[PDB]
Amino acid sequence: EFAWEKQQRKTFTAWCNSHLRKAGTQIENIDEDFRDGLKLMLLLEVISGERLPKPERGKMRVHKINNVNKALDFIASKGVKLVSIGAEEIVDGNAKMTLGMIWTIILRFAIQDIDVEETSAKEGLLLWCQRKTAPYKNVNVQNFHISWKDGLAFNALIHRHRPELIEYDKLRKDDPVTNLNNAFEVAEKYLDIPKMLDAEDIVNTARPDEKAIMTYVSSFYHAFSGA
Numbered sequence: 001e002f003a004w005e006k007q008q009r010k011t012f013t014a015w016c017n018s019h020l021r022k023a024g025t026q027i028e029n030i031d032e033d034f035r036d037g038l039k040l041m042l043l044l045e046v047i048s049g050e051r052l053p054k055p056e057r058g059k060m061r062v063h064k065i066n067n068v069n070k071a072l073d074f075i076a077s078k079g080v081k082l083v084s085i086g087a088e089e090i091v092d093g094n095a096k097m098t099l100g101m102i103w104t105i106i107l108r109f110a111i112q113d114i115d116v117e118e119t120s121a122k123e124g125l126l127l128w129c130q131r132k133t134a135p136y137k138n139v140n141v142q143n144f145h146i147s148w149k150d151g152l153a154f155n156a157l158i159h160r161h162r163p164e165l166i167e168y169d170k171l172r173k174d175d176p177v178t179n180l181n182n183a184f185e186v187a188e189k190y191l192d193i194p195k196m197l198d199a200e201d202i203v204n205t206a207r208p209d210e211k212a213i214m215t216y217v218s219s220f221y222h223a224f225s226g227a
Contacts, residue, residue, distance in 0.1 A: 004209045005099065007201055011212035012102045014196035015110075018219065019046045030102065031095045037067025037087075044074050047109040064091040080108050103211050110218045114225075122214060125221055129153070132160045138173055144210040144217065149202055151179025157217075158186055161224050165190055176203050193219045 013030045027033035034040045056063035068087035085101045116124035129141045136156040141147045159166035180199035187193040196216040
């Protein structure tokens, strides 16, 4: 397992759980817990607000294949042409394909419909970050990786919306673990955004995984898009 794979596994698991809690469940092991399709279908129902077809609960491989195909068909119905994702391989436990499928879902259901100043999707999310953090001279959001490493950008995004929650000028660029954990804990407690990044992974990786950071940042957007 490379650095990127570990980061995606942890962050995508946490994101899935932030939704599955609304249906009274959770996953633990992303490599195993979508193989029968049941929680994959439930995830899709939660994030879309829509009902999918009845699943098969019989536990034979055919049932699992049929469930995963219901999930994939639903994704396709939202205008996604799936590439390199197949039900048999999901059921049989292809770890990289499973991460790619969950990223496809995050991108479609959390990022694509973002619209900021006539700019859509990941580009619109980045523009929003840049606009909201513009006042903060010790922040420079240029990307969804290195720009987030020192923790100041996460704190600034919160402070811009909820300044009473962040003592921004007390934050030190040279204390990234403190900064990251501060933002993560404030978001968990006051914004009901579960923690999806580990501070240690962020400071230790030269270029943090941009899919993991986008996943987490997109939850801030949704917490704050009605401001």
